[model samples]
Target: NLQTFELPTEVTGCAADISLGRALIQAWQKDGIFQIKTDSEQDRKTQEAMAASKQFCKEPLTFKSSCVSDLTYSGYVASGEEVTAGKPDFPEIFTVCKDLSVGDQRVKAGWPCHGPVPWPNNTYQKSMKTFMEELGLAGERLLKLTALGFELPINTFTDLTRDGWHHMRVLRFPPQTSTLSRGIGAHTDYGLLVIAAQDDVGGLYIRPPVEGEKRNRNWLPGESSAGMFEHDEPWTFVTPTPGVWTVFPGDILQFMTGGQLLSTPHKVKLNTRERFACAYFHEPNFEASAYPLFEPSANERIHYGEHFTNMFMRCYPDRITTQRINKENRLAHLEDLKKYSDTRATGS
Candidate 1:
C-alpha cells in the first residue's frame, strides 16, 4: 500500500537543513514545501497560460519556436496501448522555461515539439521567468537537503545541477466522460526532481515502493504491467494541499544514488473537472555524467544528455525512428542499468 514519510529538519551531521525539507521529502517520499507564502502573480500567470493554451490548441500552428508541445495532435500519451485499450486519456500542452538559452538547445529539443503559439506581446514567456527562478531556488534547497540526508557534503547534489537543463511546464487536462478513464498512465519521471502545483480538481496517485522489487524498474516506462496500478499494487491518492508543492524524484537520482533513493510510480485518474498543473523539473547539466555513488563498480556511468534523450526518444516514436534506435535496444540499455542498481541493493 502507498505510504508517506517526513524528514526531520535536523539530522545528525547533516547541517544546513531547510524547513521546507520535510515537505520536500514528504512529497518526494510520498512526495511539498513548508508554508511558503503563495505568489498571486504566479498563480495569475498560470491561469492565464491555461486559458491561452485553450486558444492556442484551437488555432493552427503558425510560429515555430523551440518550445511549444502538443500532446493531443501528435497522439503522444494518447497513442499508448493503455489508452488505445479503452482507458481515458487526454491531450496536453507543454512549454519550456523561457529563460533557457539557445546554448541549451539540446535539452530543449529533447522532447516532442509542435511549433509555437503566438501570445500577446509574449506575455506568457515573460511571466514564466520569475516563476522558474523562484522554483529553481526551491529546487536547489531540496538538493542541499538531499545531500545532507545521504551524509555527504551539502553541495554534493547541487554541484552537479548548477546551470543545468531545468524545465518548467504548464499542463492542462480536459475532462473525460468514460467508464474506463485515465488522465495519464502509470509512469515515473526522467530528470532529477519535479516540483508541482496543482489545482483543486485532484486526481494524482503515487504507488509506494514494493518490497524486494527493483527500484530502478519503476523509473523506466513500459517495463511494468500496463495499468494505473498493477493488479496487486496499491496506490495512495494525492489531493491538493494549499500552498504546498508536490515533489517527485526522477530516474537520474535513482541511477546516481545506486537505488538509495527510489522514484515512485504515479498516474492521474479520470475527472469530470478540467485540471491544470504546473511543474518544475530540476535536471542534470547537459555535460554532466551520472554514476552510482555507492557501489560505483556495480553500475554503469552515463551522460545526462544521452540518457535523457534516449528515454524521450522512446516516448516519441517518430523521433526514435529517425534516430535509428529500436524499442528493444532502448529497453535493453535501461534493463542493464536496472540490473546494476539491483545488484548493489542486494550486495551481490
Candidate 2:
C-alpha cells in the first residue's frame, strides 16, 4: 500500500528535475508516506548513524541519564517518561535538535527547547554529526522535489528552510511482554517533513486519510489531531527496505499547502523483539511562519516557534519548564495531562 521512490543521485541541490518532483507529489499526496532509495555512500552513513545510536542506547542508565538535560527536548528520554495520546510511550530516545550556541539570542533568553545537545563522547559524536549534516541536506533535496512537483521553483521552500529548526530522535523500543503494548502512541509530526530510518524490526502503522469531499481537508489538526483513530479502522504497515529512507510530509507542509497534502497520522506497535529508528523532522525556521495560502477562511499566519512550543507543551506536560519560557505555553491547559497523572504520575 506504500510506494518506494527511486531518488536519483543527480537530483542533488536545485538540480532536481520537475518530473522527479511531480512523481513524488503523486505518490506522496496519495497517502502521505513514501520511501526514497538513496545512493550507496548515503546508505553507508545511515548505517553509521544507526550503529552509533544503538551504541548510545546500550549504555547503562547512569550514562544515559547524564545525557538528559534539565532543559527540554534535547537529551535522552527514558522509556515511559513521555506520554503520547495521553498514554506512556514505551521507547527510550536520544534527541538532537538545531544547535543553540551559547551566544544565540534564544539561548540567552533561556528558552525551554533551545539548549545544548548532550552527545556521547568522540566516536559517537563525530559519526552522528556527520550523518546529521548529510541527512539534513537530503531533506532539503526532498523539499525541493516537493516544490518542483507543485510546479513551483525549486527554491520555493529551500529559500526559507536554510534555517530550519530541524530535529532528530533516535529511538529504541525494547521487547514487549504484552501483545497490545504500544511503542509510540499515535501522533503526527508537527513540522514540514519527516525522513525516518527504520530497522528491520517493523511496527510502524499509518492510518490512511479519510476519503470523500473532505479528502484534502485539515481533519487531523482539528485542534491538533493526536493521532486519534478507532480500533476498527484499518491501518497500513510500513516495512523497512534497506538503503531506503521513509519520507513523509508533516503538519506544516499540510498547513502551507492549504491541505493540498496530507500529514497522515501514524503510531508504533511493540512485539517481543526490539526495534530501532532515527526520525528527522525537517522544520521551517524557528522564527518563520506559515499559513494556509489557499484557504480564504483560514489565513492567520502561524508562527512556528510558539505553535511548536505549545504542541511540545501539550505532548510532554511533565517536561514543560515553568521558568524562562512563555507563560502562555506554561499555562496552556496542564489539565490535558490529568489522565496521565491520574494513571502513571506517582514516580513511574
Candidate 3:
C-alpha cells in the first residue's frame, strides 16, 4: 500500500506570491512567524533504532558478538600516545563542572570529559538527543551522504565511540571597534559535518580560490542593455541571508569519507555586528567502536583513544606554544615550547 496527498493547483503559485506581496491585506491570515517543531519521521525512526540497540545490549546473551573484544590489550599501534601536563583553556571559557587539574592534582581534577554520552540519551545528554529527535530526514540523509562522501559503505556506522561524526564548536566573536577584531580566522571544522545556524545580522564570508587582478571579474552586473547570458565569474565573498541555515563539511569528514566529498575552506569576517551561530557536531560515543568498512584488513579499525588525542592537537595547536588562545592547559604554556621545538622545527 502507498499513501499520497496533493496540494491545490494554486498553492504553489500562492506560496510564490506570498514572498512578493507587500500589502497587509494581500498577506495570508495563516502566514506569520513560526517556530519549527522537532518531531518528524526521522526522529521516530531514530528513536526506534535507539530503543532496539539498547534492548539488544540489555538482553541476556548466551554468547557475545564477534564485534565485541577486550580493548585492554588490543595491541593497536599509535604514534604520539603520550599525555602531557597541559591545562586546556576550554573548561575556563565554558563553565565546566569541575576544575580540570592535570598532573600533580590529577586525582581531584577528574572532570567529566566532553562527548562521552551515547546517542539519544536524554538523561545526561539532552542536547544531542534533542538534536537527533528534532532533525528530520535531513540528518540521516546527511549522514548517509557523508558516509558515501568518505567512501565508506552506505551501511557502515561511524565509530561513534572514538571517531565522532564531527566536532560542533560554537564560536562567539566578541564585539570590536574595528572589523578585524570581529573576524574569525581561517580554520577548518574538525569533524565530518558542520551544521551552522545564525541570527540575521550577517558578517560571514568565504574566501574565493584565486590569485591576482585576473580574479576581480564580477558575476552580476547592475544593469545590462542587451538581452544575453552575461558571464559572471564566481568570486569568494561574504553572503548574508535571513532565516536559512548553512551546512559545511570539515576536513575530517573528507578524510574518513575517503575523499568522496569536498570540504570547502571558509572563514568569518569581523564586523561590528553581533553574531550568534549554533553548530551541531556529530561525534562518536567514547566506548563505541569505529571500524572502516572500506578497508578489509582487521588492522585498519580506528581506535578511539588515539583518534581523540590527534584531534585535540589539531583543535588546540597553541597547546605547544603559549598561554595564548587555544592553549587548554598549563603544561601547554609558553615555557613548554622547548619540549616541542624539535617537532615544530620541521613545520609540521
Number of the top lDDT candidate: 2
Would you give me the overall lDDT of model 3?
0.32
**Model 1 spans with C-alpha error above 4 angstroms:** 1-89, 97-121, 218-231, 319-348
In order, what is each prediction's RMSD in angstroms?
8.0, 8.0, 18.6
TM-score of each: 0.69, 0.86, 0.43
Clashes of 2: 0
Off by over 4 Å in 3: 1-138, 146-153, 157-167, 179-182, 207-238, 286-305, 313-348
Candidate 3 structure quality by residue, lDDT tens digits, 164-193? 333333233334553234244343443445
Q: Which pairs of residues collide in model 2?
A: none
Q: Candidate 1: what lDDT? A: 0.54
lDDT of each: 0.54, 0.72, 0.32
Which lDDT tens digits does candidate 2 get at residues 55-146?
Answer: 88888998897885544567778898877767788899888887666676556545556767778777877777787887888888788888
Q: Local error of candidate 3 at 33, Å?
A: 27
For model 1, how does the per-residue alpha-carbon lDDT over 39-114 read when each residue is reduced to its tens digit? 5654565555556545544443333222323311121122122241134345464546324233443223332221
Candidate 1 worst ten-residue window by lDDT:
71-80
